[PDB]
Ligand binder design. Structure first.
Ligand SMILES: CCNC(=O)Nc1nc2cc(-c3cncc(F)c3)cc(-c3ncccn3)c2[nH]1
Length: 184
């Protein structure tokens, strides 16, 4: 299932080049866009963090955490273990703010490192996905381009007016850059 994504990456994302690397971001952002189109999220945040980790945050309902009829595993674990981004990431973390609780799970090459755990309390709702693209899959470059992400984030904000979409570059902690889009 998920081992097939690691052997044929291009079959799922197109290429293991700069284009494919950026497609990973788009596959996570699209989920937050779906949550905004469903009527629950109105704020999306994309962060290029240190060592080219990507953090995508929305203020939707939070990916469901309820135990399933099929697996006996939380809905979020089922969803993430079928995720191409998760399969192609050397590391991926999830934080779900839901039911006044903060739930967390980490994966390595799509494989869960521990069971979903409650790690805090919250008055907010939403999902946080942090991932570090697998450097063995992505050989050409693992370095994100700001202008490529910005150009697309601005188009998404224009296609989904009323949704606040923010892009931040934190790779240089001494010089942080931010572009926030919010069309009326
Ligand atoms: C950072 C990436 N953001 C998300 O993945 N946001 C997100 N919010 C969700 C809410 C529901 C959701 C919550 N409550 C009730 C529902 F019916 C759906 C379901 C999903 C989901 N479902 C299938 C695949 C991927 N994501 C969400 N993703």
């Amino acid at each position: 299932g998920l081992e097939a994504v690691r052997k044929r990456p291009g079959m799922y994302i197109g290429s293991t080049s700069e284009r494919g690397l950026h497609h990973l971001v788009w596959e996570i952002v699209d989920n937050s866009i779906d949550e905004a189109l469903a009527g629950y999220a109105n704020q999306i945040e994309v962060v290029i963090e240190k060592d080219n980790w990507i953090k995508v945050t929305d203020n939707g309902r939070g990916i469901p955490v309820d135990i399933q009829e099929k697996m006996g595993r939380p809905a979020v674990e089922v969803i993430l273990t079928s995720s191409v981004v998760n399969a192609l990431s050397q590391d991926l973390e999830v934080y779900v703010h839901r039911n006044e609780t903060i739930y967390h799970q980490a994966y390595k090459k799509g494989v869960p490192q521990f069971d979903l755990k409650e790690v805090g309390t919250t008055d907010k709702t939403g999902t946080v996905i942090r991932f570090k693209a697998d450097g063995e899959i992505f050989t050409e470059t693992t370095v994100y381009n700001y202008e490529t992400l910005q150009q697309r984030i601005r188009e998404l904000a224009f296609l989904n007016k009323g949704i606040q979409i923010t892009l931040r570059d934190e790779r240089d902690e001494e010089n942080v850059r931010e572009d926030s889009y919010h069309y009326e």
